[PDB]
Symmetry: C2
Subunit: 425 residues, 2 copies
Amino acid sequence: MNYARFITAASAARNPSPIRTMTDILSRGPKSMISLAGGLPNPNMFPFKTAVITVENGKTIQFGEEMMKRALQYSPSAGIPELLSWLKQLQIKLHNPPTIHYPPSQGQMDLCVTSGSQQGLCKVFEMIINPGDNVLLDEPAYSGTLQSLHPLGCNIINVASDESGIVPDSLRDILSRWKPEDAKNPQKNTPKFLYTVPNGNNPTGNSLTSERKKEIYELARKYDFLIIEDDPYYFLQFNKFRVPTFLSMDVDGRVIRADSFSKIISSGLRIGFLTGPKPLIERVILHIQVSTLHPSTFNQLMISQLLHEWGEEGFMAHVDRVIDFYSNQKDAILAAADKWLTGLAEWHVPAAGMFLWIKVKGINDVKELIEEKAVKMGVLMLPGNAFYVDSSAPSPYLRASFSSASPEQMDVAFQVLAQLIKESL
Amino acid sequence: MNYARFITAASAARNPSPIRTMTDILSRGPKSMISLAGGLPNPNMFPFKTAVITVENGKTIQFGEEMMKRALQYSPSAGIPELLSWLKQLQIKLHNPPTIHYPPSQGQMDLCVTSGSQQGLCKVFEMIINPGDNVLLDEPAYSGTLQSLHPLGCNIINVASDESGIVPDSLRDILSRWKPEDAKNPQKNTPKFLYTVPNGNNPTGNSLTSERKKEIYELARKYDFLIIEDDPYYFLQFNKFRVPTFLSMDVDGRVIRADSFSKIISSGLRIGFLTGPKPLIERVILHIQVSTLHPSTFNQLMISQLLHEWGEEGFMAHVDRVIDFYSNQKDAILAAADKWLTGLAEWHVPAAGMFLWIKVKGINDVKELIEEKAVKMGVLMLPGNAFYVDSSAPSPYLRASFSSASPEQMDVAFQVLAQLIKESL
């Protein structure tokens, strides 16, 4: 409703970078006209000439001479138009956001392709946070998010969470520190946003329920804060009826969503995208315009041509193949845990994602148990300390990945782990 | 010497992001050991399987099944090791920096592959600048740099420049506002750095001389500021004895250099690199670790395999082919200017780069002359207003690109331009 409340002075001060202003009046109008105004290098000098990329369950992708020249040249900061248009239709199909036809100033849905979803998130955090600002999130959280927020000088207020994600009652009690009208008061420092990973949180594997999302959204309206929906495992849910997203219920235009292709299409190509209210997305684009400029044109065209030949049907079929693999991996690590860790640890079944979150009984810090008996016993898992703001506190938790291990390796790994628990206890 | 003076509180507060700490003790030591600690998605799910990329004057690049899996997966934040090692040897060959074997803390040379050179520059500006800080540069300057510095709240102090770049006498007079010891004084606000494009400045085309670089470096030592050497046209110099760089004379470890492949290899692949003192490069890497994470693995491997088969010899031969093309383009636009604009405008011969900088006689603002008689006469060039901090001031300058136009198009464009000058005058 008043987006200036969520934009720093520095972010609001950004102005558009003109690599389109004079290259603008060239297509339409006088088609026979000469322009010595662009800042583009001559692509005929570039050494790569054609490309052929094979695809499993898809048509081979080919860049001919002219397409290769485009792939090797600058492109628009928000992304190439055919990828933006395909992704916009995907978001309408999956989430039907209420904001599609809003006026720009009151939150019209807008998309920005980013160089990985984390780039979008980082520039969103930078857009909003002044030192001393209060922000809300649930621990344990992705260590990369915690390391991104740390230098911004915000106070991170932990919201309680359980096996169904954020607990609305905890959020409501935290917010009772303020009155709703304090959000309009410059002195009061009400929280600027709530950040969460609603599906398959890294490291816990837990996901929010539909009922809790509705409750949380009502609190976000009442105290007027944004919801940053960081959803990189949205396409890795094992339920296969997906819970409606915050974006799908965002009648106010207060949700910024980050989607990722890193887990289903490619992490190395560095292509994700943000969806959110136009005034906030515009601030991110302007920051991109003076940093990365745009995501790799080559990699966007690879993905765009894949997605267009797949169609939404082929995309969802690919998603379902990937879910099938990870769900079988999940069953396998749960079976190994059932056999070897029962009575020595506790865990919840992951609802989505790639990780199993294991609490060891009768030990206060597993960092000693793991890092010390590592090279020794030949097994390695990740201590949970890194997923809390205070990583120095002791943690009895371990994060175990099931993305790659074979059932044999899982059995060996947990056999070894079980013996150390019984020796250290 | 004291790098903390050039690092903001927020930048200094960044800590390493652990996507290597536990994936570390896996290669060496116990080679038979199981790790459930990584955070990598399974690359067998990714849909692209092989790639074949043809190369002019080079061997065809092929990604087989295993190389493709690597290209589609996360990689180190500073770049893939074989690209970093090749680029390090290139920098030693071209610049033999004095800092190669310094201790890390006193400026050991370090490299970071970035997602385009401008990303490195942006994160360097963000690393250094507090609101109110003073910075030095020469106008006219690249509009993207000006738009990057504007929201950071620094005072930009203009240093005089002529056809040989920055004028040392102007820099010395500006610096006489302070005493050298003021650089150690928290209250005095001596300039943090000098930024310049030393070869083929955009928009002027002018380049610094060797004698002036030595003078400028001595001033940077005396008043202890950094030199940010933004050199995207280093490989597009028409002289073909290249002037020694600031990096080549950096005995103190006070130079941060940005190199670009955007003009010679590819702008769309978004691959550049920073070279500088390890403590400052480390701050940039940590920021990358929470934003883009790394440059596209796929595109790095494309470039790395090209460069390794070329060798330094094949790389320099490619550079010389590109210089040959742009120098012939330069001769062509100068010929068209000689024929049609003589007596109506003044220009200096570009020493490097892609642009001709034209001053129109007897008119105060060419923005009216160009933008209004655009669709009309069918010719387009870029008003110079965008390359000054105060873009509202009138500018009699035009930037004309010679990267692409044919000699015919240049003749037509300047014929049209000449008539408007004679009608408007």
